[PDB]
Amino acid sequence: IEEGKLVIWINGDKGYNGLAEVGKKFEKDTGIKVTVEHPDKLEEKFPQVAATGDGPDIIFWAHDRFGGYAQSGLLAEITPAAAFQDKLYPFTWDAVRYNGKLIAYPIAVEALSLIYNKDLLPNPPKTWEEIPALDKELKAKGKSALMFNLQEPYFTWPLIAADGGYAFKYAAGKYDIKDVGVDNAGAKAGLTFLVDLIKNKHMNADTDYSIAEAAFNKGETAMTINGPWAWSNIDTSAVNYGVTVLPTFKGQPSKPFVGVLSAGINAASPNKELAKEFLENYLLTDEGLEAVNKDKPLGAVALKSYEEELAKDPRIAATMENAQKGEIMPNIPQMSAFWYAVRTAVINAASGRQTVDAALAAAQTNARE
Amino acid sequence: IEEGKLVIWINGDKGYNGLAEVGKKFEKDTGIKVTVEHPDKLEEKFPQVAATGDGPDIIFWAHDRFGGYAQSGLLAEITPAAAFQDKLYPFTWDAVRYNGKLIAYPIAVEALSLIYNKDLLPNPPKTWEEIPALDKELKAKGKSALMFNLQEPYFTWPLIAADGGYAFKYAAGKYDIKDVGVDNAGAKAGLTFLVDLIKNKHMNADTDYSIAEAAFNKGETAMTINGPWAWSNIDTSAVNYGVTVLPTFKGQPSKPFVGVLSAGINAASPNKELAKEFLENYLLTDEGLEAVNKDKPLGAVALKSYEEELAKDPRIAATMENAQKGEIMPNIPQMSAFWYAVRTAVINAASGRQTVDAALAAAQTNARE
Ligand SMILES: OC[C@H]1O[C@H](O[C@H]2[C@H](O)[C@@H](O)[C@@H](O)O[C@@H]2CO)[C@H](O)[C@@H](O)[C@@H]1O
Ligand SMILES: OC[C@H]1O[C@H](O[C@H]2[C@H](O)[C@@H](O)[C@@H](O)O[C@@H]2CO)[C@H](O)[C@@H](O)[C@@H]1O
């Protein structure tokens, strides 16, 4: 492959002439020649040549082939700025993400359509089952009902998949409830640091929600850790406060468990419709959420409309920054057992009833049950 | 629980008076009284009472508890219309999805942040490690560096998780390359229907891309199945055509494999920067994509700006309708083996060299090797 040139492969059925024009402008601007080719079976050829360090600088194809190319080490990992990545839909980036790395730029989403001649057939059939009859009608006019590519499985697949054909089954992401990471070295280091703060009287083991809030809001302490709901009381307070990213530990960002405030309907409630009505039509509106939010801030609401408006708040922006650095909380049943286990571990380690090692090791065992 | 009333539980730290006001409006509109309560330990109480068929009509909590509630059969499965579901961010719906069912309405996302008093501390510490020193300084002023709730593990967890603490390890959703669904009854039914169309001379097994396109564009056939790239040639043709949803089979929507045309960069290319420049700055622009699109339509482009403009096209709308009913293609290496397997099966079944059963059974084995 020549340096200071760009060779592009794209399939013949796509607008390679249009791409070539983009190449002409690139050449005009940069003096770098851009050669667009559409070889036969380019998608089969590319691996073969690319293995040998030869072939095009850029290959165009549906993403489905690229995992294979990546796995063979034929694709360079792409590194677009976050700014650029935001310009494309995330699901298209998912298509080109292989083993965590981006391996291609998404370009366009292609799906088969039923294309019909309005002059022969003003209302196309809504079922496949109608087509034989339609064909009978049309054959009497020396026409046929339907013809499409039967050589490529891509074209016949929609009908094959229709009643439950699939390629490979997608396994849901499970949670390993035997993989507990409370007693690993990361947890130990973190908690040890916390215990050390207490030991050096920088913090008091006795501190609870009330004490912490009152101390911060009385301007007795420089900083607190708390969620959106807390802001109301700080606004009440004469304290001029900022809401920011959590501090790093060992150069890693603090990783808060993210909650989704959520409204469940009692299975035993005879008022399910009413519950549905209230939540859907009253609470989950700009007006409803604003009412709650005005009392105590919710944070980043789940309703897109109001959230967009709320996101202007730098406190909410900080909320979301910390959210992204942290993890959404599992909703599995074992979560309560996990919480209880860590609660006890922290308390006992902080109070000095137990060492960090022993406390966490105990939590490990408790959380696993 | 009493019918024709609504009892709501929400934690005391959230804005329950504001919620109550939403309840007052609901009552005004519907005459249904809404009682908002904030019991102590409501999250522990709810399961207890709910088991007995009693408790609030609606329970509010972070999603983390709801899996547990669901598992105990305390929550009614919620059924919002797709229209409503689109109004909330999907990741919040994920939080409330348990064993495939929605079990709660997501309300708002909460994350702990560092809150600091700008008047005491204009620049908050970017690391935990600075805090001891900061505290020393502040104690000499009769203040402390940090105080927060140590009694709830939620507050200490960010530091514990920071350096690699985790609850339970989350296993990413795999693709099972041993679970192949080409020879299931849905695939058999679909392909059988196709073979039957050929057997009844409604279609010719020999029909390929060229033949199909030429036939439709010459107004010889009522319908073809094809992608956006095909439209150019039909516009050229005097044919008056529409682009629509694929027909249903056995009252199921056709499920086309969705491809994302994507551009990968050759790992062996010395021109990687140039490739990056061209793709990012020339192709993936309104202008670049318009150039390609004008030659042969791309469909729904991945670039948000241009896509929004393109979406006005009813052909693209139909494209997206079909896309949503179908599935994005896996990008895994085994995809090529899958395609090859189906290609052969279809050809052999259509040509009549093999029966649908034998062809698909063979494809099954070939796809899983
Ligand atoms: O067939 C033309 C059309 O389909 C393509 O799908 C291919 C797939 O990408 C290949 O790897 C192949 O082995 O099987 C499929 C067709 O059976 C492309 O996805 C698409 O862009 C192209 O226009
Ligand atoms: O702790 C109060 C504050 O955090 C909560 O997180 C809880 C969790 O929800 C509970 O079930 C518990 O066992 O563990 C965590 C605290 O350890 C809520 O998620 C949050 O909204 C609440 O305001």
Numbering used by the authors:
A (entry chain B), B (entry chain A): 3 to 371
Provide the authors' own sentences about this structure as they appear in the paper.
The Maltose-Binding Protein (MBP) is a component of the Escherichia coli maltose/maltodextrin system, which regulates the uptake and catabolism of maltrodextrins as part of the chemotactic response. Subsequently, this tendency to crystallize has been further increased by an MBP version engineered to reduce surface entropy13(MBPeng). The fragments of interest being relatively short (28 and 49 residues for FAK(residues 805–832) and PYK2(residues 790–839), respectively), we decided to produce them as C-terminal MBP fusion proteins.
To understand the molecular basis for the observed dimerization, we crystallized the protein fractions corresponding to the dimeric species of MBPeng-KFLFAK and of MBPeng-KFLPYK2. The six KFLPYK2-fused MBP molecules were in the closed maltose-bound conformation, as expected given that 2 mM maltose were included in all purification and crystallization buffers. During model rebuilding and refinement, it became apparent that adjacent MBP molecules formed the same intricately interlaced arm-exchange dimers in both MBPeng-KFLFAK and MBPeng-KFLPYK2 crystals, (harbouring two and three dimers per ASU, respectively). Instead of a tight β-turn at residues 173–176, the protein chains adopted an extended β-strand structure, crossing straight into the second MBP structure for both MBPeng-FAKKFL and MBPeng-KFLPYK2. Because MBP’s polypeptide chain goes back and forth between its N-terminal and C-terminal lobes, this chain crossing resulted in highly intertwined dimers, where the two domains of both MBP molecules are constituted by both polypeptide chains. This structural architecture produced an extremely high contact surface between both chains (~11,300 Å2), corresponding to a calculated solvation free energy gain (∆iG) of −174.5 kcal/mol. Following structural refinement, clear electron density was only found for the Asn-Ala linker and the first (in the KFLPYK2 crystal) or the first five (KFLFAK) passenger protein residues. MalE is a close homologue of E. coli MBP (94.32% sequence identity), and with an RMSD of 0.35 Å over 365 residues MalE was the closest structural match in the PDB to our dimer-swapped MBPeng-KFLPYK2.
